[PDB]
């Protein structure tokens, strides 16, 4: 259950500052070799971050 | 006896490597600087994720939910909480130090 | 309108798993008793938060 937000187009490789349904922050984002499972949304740090 | 003190000699320093080469345990004393000083790091970081009376332990998530009047005071708990973790380590590390 | 774990003008921003809409009605006096941390006649033993 999302907000009346206008979506982007997701930039690559880049210092973005990002919201990815309301969980914000900044970073670069590169594609992942992380084997997600079907039903995981995200995952975390030791530090309990994104 | 200069022969057979020189062979004492060289006898004893190849047992020194076999016991070194043999137990990690001859180290110990600096192994344990390496533990301690990287025990207070993870402490220091699973810090973070304590929230401290707060609604949430990441800053994010509290300031994308709260306008200032009340993120202000959701923020001054984690700051409090994350200061005094600072001030816990500096001193444990000061102490160490010495 | 009173919002407790959010404020009511970052609702649009956040995006939410599951939202529940808790419908009845109370006189007007025992409002102020839909919210968390109270009690009284309807707090304790009727609709609480």
Do not use: H, W
Request: with cysteine.
């Amino acid at each position: 259950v999302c907000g009346p937000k206008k979506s982007t187009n997701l930039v690559k490789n880049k210092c973005v500052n990002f919201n990815f349904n309301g969980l914000t922050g900044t970073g670069v984002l590169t594609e992942s070799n992380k084997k997600f499972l079907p039903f995981q949304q995200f995952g975390r740090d030791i530090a309990d971050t994104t | 006896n200069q022969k057979l003190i020189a062979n004492q000699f060289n006898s004893a320093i190849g047992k020194i490597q076999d016991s070194l080469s043999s137990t990690a345990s001859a180290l110990g004393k600096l192994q344990d600087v390496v533990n301690q000083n990287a025990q207070a790091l993870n402490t220091l970081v699973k810090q973070l994720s304590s929230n401290f009376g707060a609604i949430s332990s990441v800053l994010n998530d509290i300031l994308s939910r709260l306008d200032p009047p009340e993120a202000e005071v959701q923020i001054d708990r984690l700051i409090t909480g994350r200061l005094q973790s600072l001030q816990t380590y500096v001193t444990q590390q000061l102490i160490r130090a010495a | 309108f009173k919002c407790y774990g959010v404020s009511p003008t970052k609702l649009n921003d956040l995006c939410f798993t599951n939202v529940y809409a808790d419908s009845f009605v109370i006189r007007g006096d025992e409002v102020r008793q839909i919210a968390p941390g109270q009690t009284g006649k309807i707090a304790d033993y009727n609709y609480k938060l």
